[PDB]
Amino acid sequence: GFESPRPYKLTHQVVCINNINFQRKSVVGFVELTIFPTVANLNRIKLNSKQCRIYRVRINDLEAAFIYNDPTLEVCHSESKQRNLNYFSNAYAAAVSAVDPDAGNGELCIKVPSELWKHVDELKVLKIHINFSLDQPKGGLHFVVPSVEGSMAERGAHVFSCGYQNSTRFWFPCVDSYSELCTWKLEFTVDAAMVAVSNGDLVETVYTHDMRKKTFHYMLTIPTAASNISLAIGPFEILVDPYMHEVTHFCLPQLLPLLKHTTSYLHEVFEFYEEILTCRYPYSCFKTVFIDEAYVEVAAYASMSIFSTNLLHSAMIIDETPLTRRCLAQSLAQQFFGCFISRMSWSDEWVLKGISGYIYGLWMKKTFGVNEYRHWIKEELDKIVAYELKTGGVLLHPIFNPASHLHFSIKHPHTLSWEYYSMFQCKAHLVMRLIENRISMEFMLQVFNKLLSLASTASSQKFQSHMWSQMLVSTSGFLKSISNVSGKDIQPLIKQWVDQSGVVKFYGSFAFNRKRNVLELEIKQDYTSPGTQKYVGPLKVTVQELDGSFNHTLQIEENSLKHDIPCHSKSRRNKKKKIPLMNGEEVDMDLSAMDADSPLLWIRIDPDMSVLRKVEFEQADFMWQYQLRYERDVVAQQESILALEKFPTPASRLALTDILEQEQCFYRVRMSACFCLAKIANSMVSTWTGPPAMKSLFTRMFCCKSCPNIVKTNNFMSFQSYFLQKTMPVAMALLRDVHNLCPKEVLTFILDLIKYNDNRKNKFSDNYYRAEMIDALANSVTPAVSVNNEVRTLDNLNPDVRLILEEITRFLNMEKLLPSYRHTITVSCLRAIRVLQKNGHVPSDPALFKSYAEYGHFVDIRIAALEAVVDYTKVDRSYEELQWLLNMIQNDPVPYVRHKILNMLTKNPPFTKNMESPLCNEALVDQLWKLMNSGTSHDWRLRCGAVDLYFTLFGLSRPSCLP
Amino acid sequence: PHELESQFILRLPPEYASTVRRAVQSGHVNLKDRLTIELHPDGRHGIVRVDRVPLASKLVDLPCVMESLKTIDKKTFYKTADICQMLVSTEKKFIWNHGITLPLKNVRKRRFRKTAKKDVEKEVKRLLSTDAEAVSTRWEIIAED
Amino acid sequence: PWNLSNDEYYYPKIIQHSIPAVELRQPFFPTHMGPIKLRQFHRPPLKKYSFGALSQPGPHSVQPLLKHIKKKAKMREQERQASGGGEMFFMRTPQDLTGKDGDLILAEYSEENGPLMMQVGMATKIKNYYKRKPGKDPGAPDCKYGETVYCHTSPFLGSLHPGQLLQAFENNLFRAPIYLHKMPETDFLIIRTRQGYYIRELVDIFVVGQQCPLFEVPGPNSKRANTHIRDFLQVFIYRLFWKSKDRPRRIRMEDIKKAFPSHSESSIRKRLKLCADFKRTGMDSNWWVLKSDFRLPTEEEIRAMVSPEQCCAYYSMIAAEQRLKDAGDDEVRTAPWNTTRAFIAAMKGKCLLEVTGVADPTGCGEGFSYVKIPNKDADLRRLSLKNAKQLLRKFGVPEEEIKKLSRWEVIDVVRTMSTERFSVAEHQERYKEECQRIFDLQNKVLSSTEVLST
């Protein structure tokens, strides 16, 4: 049951936009809302509006009086001397709650005229006609106007609606909540050479009487929220999908072949999401818009998605096809379960984010294989346990503070830190995988189909929300639908992993009792760490003995420590028979390293990742080597690679080398075995016999049979030896001689890989392989032996580093004339120049990176150069570079770059709270408090980034370096 | 508490079965007055009264075991009860040799393996009681006499 | 841009009972069965009521349930369409397991005492195994009940003919071929309760062939038998502690002695040793209270302790124990622990079964028997073949043996006369062909709507 927090119900909204002026960056328009009051004596009506100048408001064609105030413009007063962050977080939460449409509130308060009170008490319709104007919007709708001359279509100027969550208040007045569903009528009067893309279906396109402008009329009969309404106006090249004909793809001019190749996969994504769920795609059209200077890499609205043009690749670009493919896939998953089925509160957001991430993981499983699915699930679980042990924990479904261990309030999406938002979505889809583990996948897809079918029977009624609230899901409704389809309720699993905000830590060690033939496990939990919680459920453990692989369920109550499980025979060591594996197959194992008295080959605690856990198991090194070689699970091979770094014995070198030589191993395991072999080789110097590690293996796999030092000409058509070939010198460059310097046998090998590179014969580009070669050249740089702080001059230039510097100069200059893909070699060469500057080789001068960060280099070039400037101002304690970065945060045209500068200055801070630095003035505290209070008031993501930066630099209390 | 329901099969003469079938498929409570089933304190004898006409009944044991299976979707079936008795209307006499379906006829005689059945233990208990209430007992395995 | 997961090297290639059944309620799953209740196992007599409407003898008006059946079916369809329209789980109460609603079929058994048999409240599925014809086939003959599956590898002992659909009961206990027959014309189903008689018609009755057991019945005094005995007692004790209303939870010993009266009270004492303490002292004077440190297990842990199929295997064992005990080695072979062990071992390929024997539940040539069977001159050297050929001609040996010239058998036959086929493929092939012929004849007889004379 859904009861509105608003005293009115909104039925229909007309959004008309005229006079989109690109020179002056200005729009004019009106908005006409059709509300039905649910309570009599409505009097004031409270709507949401930011940055719009409200000209006049007429209610039922009668002139009404409005008052506007935004408390989130300046959160705390300018003349308050408070400088602690808890004060700002409480004031910011109160300010966002005072404009919240999820309460009854709002920023624009319109007073109902007196003569309509007899029209409002007996509950009859009210039609509110606001007309407004955006004069020059800061972060409302992004105007990308290039400075080439010509007409606005000839120079490539466009507008798009940017922002996250409820940010539609930034460009027209609305009820900007996900729970106020209404039908829509959208008119946009644009130039005759431009096209206006928006939500709904385009009913017509009429000309103006001078035929210089045309009006696009859109209609949206599926009741969506105001937060799902978008807009993209530009000189877009239109491409109808040749497979599905209601899907149109819009790109920027001169990028039509890239659009043709890139969006050619999307019909398979449509077919997948419509056959695992049994509902068809709910909207009547689908539109993909590719734009410049995007807010996020992929945004999903109702019947529309806005991607950045940096996803567009051609047919000869690999290492970008899977990333763009999965961006399209998660936009479509959010089309199904973020835009059609919406949110009932700010709680129950974990339901939608979990269903979107879970069905996108099912797509990844079918498309890229079960092994890529397991690797992705393991990397998300590691990312979560790292974040939750780092700071507090992520709390899905809080109850309204519920989480007081962290420096922001979780009551609203616009007060969350961006890393918390990312980890929120990540934990939501892993908890949905856990619900699939308890209640099987076919029942899970039946739950999702039951939600979609209720929403689509709801979506066709005309009753103003008598039935339109069946399109809003809640937690209680989701659990009730689960209990309807399965008969089991998941309330212990919901109580543990949703309502409780923690992950578990397992420390395991075993001992084999030879007398009674049992395996005594010893599993203890660390439940006193700040991020942890105590697990009391069951726990699966998989033991591989000589007779095969056996699963055991252990009951781990609070007082439990020793778990005795039984062991089988050892009669497959009496005769040589094959040892049967986890799957149905069996292999020949070399049992010379195994103990004579124990049959068990390896043990895995929680193999299926059925809890949110971090396992620290203490096996013997031969058990880790057997688990690396003969396991049929990629997460166990990865964890054995990760645990073999502590055992540098030559049997582990043989194990990793046998993994590296082995095709029919998953390629991301061999790419990890490269770096593990490099670390082991560095640890057993003065024992290593022959050549450096992986060199003979590289010449055996990727070089000519007649010439060992000449590499084969590039043929990248295998896509697994391409990735292994481009990752093996990067790990090989981490080799170090007893003198702690990279050997001149590996550096010469990398330089010969660079010289003899011929790419005139493959059908794929070479930009990522050459960029990884520059990364391998950067990995070999050891710190220089400066004497008496000698100025870095030609005489003290290392003879090794002169070759590296010549190569990166040649590569960067050739990129200036023949540019690659993603300026990947520019990014790699800027990263390598920063590596050479971090050691004492090149003079520590930020002027090169400051010229590449000037608004104009690839956004990738820009963020690489700004990363180099952030690293410089951390190491050299530069005041003027920090003022340069803070000025670039305040006034840069691209808001993604501002968010990225705040993000990089949070990750690599110039000082922490513990450090005494010269940069801890009262002036810097006043600048950052002014940046939290004012200055970042227009983005909701810059303000949370400024809160994160103030927390990283000065902590939760009063800045110490202050009177 | 819950008590398992006890379902049995009622066999009627064919004309009376047709009248009872028509009255059941009609669905009125008029059938409730018409058809009655008396059960006698023998436990294996009764009257079924169709339209107030008395018919003589015997509750017999069926050779196979039937099970009623209900369903909501006609794909998954849930067992509701076990049927083993039939009140045919018109000890060894209370045992039915045939099964309800056409292929199962003379099942007890032909399609049933002759597992030895011993009822017999009760007679042995009575003999033990006559023993324990005596004073002197004399026994001999005998021959023809 | 492709799969790139070497999946062929890492990975080279269901029954939901009612909530009264998985919770092991005593009416449906009895704690103790006496001798007269073990002789009437799965044949429950018609009991006389002491109190109720049927306890007073005389004309007991029987009742129609037509309106009840269609009202309950319409109500369940409303529940299913309110829950999103998918497939739902309905059997959540004991009152869901009545015969008064839903589509009832009957299922008759061919054997007198099967090795395994379902209790009341347990679920089973109907699978229609259909072997396609060689090359082109129209499609499975459609069937009213069950789901169709295409079986290249015959589940049963014989193999399906091309184009032959065979229905079967499939659950965790057994798998058995069933044959749909129409009901007799004068047979209706009377459901009697304490309140009155109720009548349904039946139209569908299956005949269930010889079961193929999938669960092994334990033997008497086995380790699995005694494990079940104490596990069942522990589950009953935990569910009595859950039902207790006092805090801390307390039970009485003679409730357990009423449920399990054959148990010595020492066994019950030990099951109460861990998890309860006799509070003789004033605090709950003389009460078997739950220990304060003991965490009573949740519902899913108690369900994971004992399975309903283990209870059915135990009931089969104790019923067969009673029948053997009443009838004073051939009978011991026909005991379900032996036959279930034999069939499951034959399905792994350990051993073979003599398909004609004494464990045959028919007593004639129809049906199988599941008992385990073994899985598997001086001058004659100078005869030098040609003269041995002439000698075999002289003795009157038939020309086939003379013709083979394979002397492996020739001189052995000249030795046999002067005194006067491979099991690997051979035996297995012969057993399979005999089983297939027997199965086809049995299916035709057991699917014939032909009237059989009394």
UniProtKB/Swiss-Prot annotation, chain A:
The keyword Phosphoprotein applies. One of its GO terms (cellular component) is transcription factor TFTC complex. Expressed in all tissues tested. Changing T168R: In NEDFCF; uncertain significance. GO terms for biological process: G2/M transition of mitotic cell cycle; mRNA transcription by RNA polymerase II; positive regulation of DNA-templated transcription; positive regulation of transcription initiation by RNA polymerase II; regulation of DNA repair; regulation of transcription by RNA polymerase II; RNA polymerase II preinitiation complex assembly; transcription initiation at RNA polymerase II promoter. It is found in: Nucleus. Keywords: Disease variant, Intellectual disability, Nucleus, Phosphoprotein, Transcription, Transcription regulation. Its main location: nucleus. GO terms for molecular function: chromatin binding; RNA polymerase II general transcription initiation factor activity; transcription cis-regulatory region binding. The keyword Cell cycle does not apply. The TFIID basal transcription factor complex plays a major role in the initiation of RNA polymerase II (Pol II)-dependent transcription. TFIID recognizes and binds promoters with or without a TATA box via its subunit TBP, a TATA-box-binding protein, and promotes assembly of the pre-initiation complex (PIC). The TFIID complex consists of TBP and TBP-associated factors (TAFs), including TAF1, TAF2, TAF3, TAF4, TAF5, TAF6, TAF7, TAF8, TAF9, TAF10, TAF11, TAF12 and TAF13. TAF2 forms a promoter DNA binding subcomplex of TFIID, together with TAF7 and TAF1. Belongs to the TAF2 family. It is linked to Neurodevelopmental disorder with feeding difficulties, thin corpus callosum, and foot deformity: An autosomal recessive disorder characterized by impaired intellectual development, microcephaly, delayed psychomotor development, pyramidal signs, thin corpus callosum, and foot deformity. This is Transcription initiation factor TFIID subunit 2.
Curated annotation (Swiss-Prot), chain B:
One of its GO terms (cellular component) is transcription regulator complex. GO terms for molecular function: DNA-binding transcription factor binding; histone acetyltransferase binding; nuclear thyroid hormone receptor binding; nuclear vitamin D receptor binding; P-TEFb complex binding; protein heterodimerization activity; RNA polymerase II general transcription initiation factor activity; TFIIH-class transcription factor complex binding. Ubiquitous. Its main location: nucleus. It comes from the Eukaryota. One of its GO terms (biological process) is positive regulation of transcription by RNA polymerase II. The modification Phosphoserine is found at S129. It is found in: Nucleus. Keywords: Coiled coil, Nucleus, Phosphoprotein, Transcription, Transcription regulation, Ubl conjugation. Phosphorylated by CIITA. Ubiquitinated by TRIM26; leading to proteasomal degradation. The keyword Phosphoprotein applies. Belongs to the TAF7 family. The TFIID basal transcription factor complex plays a major role in the initiation of RNA polymerase II (Pol II)-dependent transcription. TFIID recognizes and binds promoters with or without a TATA box via its subunit TBP, a TATA-box-binding protein, and promotes assembly of the pre-initiation complex (PIC). The TFIID complex consists of TBP and TBP-associated factors (TAFs), including TAF1, TAF2, TAF3, TAF4, TAF5, TAF6, TAF7, TAF8, TAF9, TAF10, TAF11, TAF12 and TAF13. TAF7 forms a promoter DNA binding subcomplex of TFIID, together with TAF1 and TAF2. Overexpression of TAF7 in HeLa cells inhibits cyclin D1 and cyclin A gene transcription and causes the cells to accumulate in early S phase. In contrast, depletion of TAF7 from TFIID complexes by siRNAs increases histone H3 acetylation at both cyclin promoters and stimulates cyclins CCND1 and CCNA gene transcription. This is Transcription initiation factor TFIID subunit 7. The gene is TAF7.
Swiss-Prot record, chain C:
It is linked to Dystonia 3, torsion, X-linked: An X-linked dystonia-parkinsonism disorder. Dystonia is defined by the presence of sustained involuntary muscle contractions, often leading to abnormal postures. DYT3 is characterized by severe progressive torsion dystonia followed by parkinsonism. It has a well-defined pathology of extensive neuronal loss and mosaic gliosis in the striatum (caudate nucleus and putamen) which appears to resemble that in Huntington disease. Intellectual developmental disorder, X-linked, syndromic 33: A syndrome characterized by intellectual deficit, delayed psychomotor development, delayed speech and language, and characteristic facial features. Changing M117I: In a lung bronchoalveolar carcinoma sample; somatic mutation. Phosphorylated by casein kinase II in vitro. Disulfide bonds: none annotated. It is found in: Nucleus. Belongs to the TAF1 family. The gene is TAF1. The TFIID basal transcription factor complex plays a major role in the initiation of RNA polymerase II (Pol II)-dependent transcription. TFIID recognizes and binds promoters with or without a TATA box via its subunit TBP, a TATA-box-binding protein, and promotes assembly of the pre-initiation complex (PIC). The TFIID complex consists of TBP and TBP-associated factors (TAFs), including TAF1, TAF2, TAF3, TAF4, TAF5, TAF6, TAF7, TAF8, TAF9, TAF10, TAF11, TAF12 and TAF13. TAF1 is the largest component and core scaffold of the TFIID complex, involved in nucleating complex assembly. This is Transcription initiation factor TFIID subunit 1. The Bromo domain mediates interaction with histones that have acetylated lysine residues at specific positions. The second domain also recognizes and binds histones that are butyrylated and crotonylated. Coiled coil: none annotated.
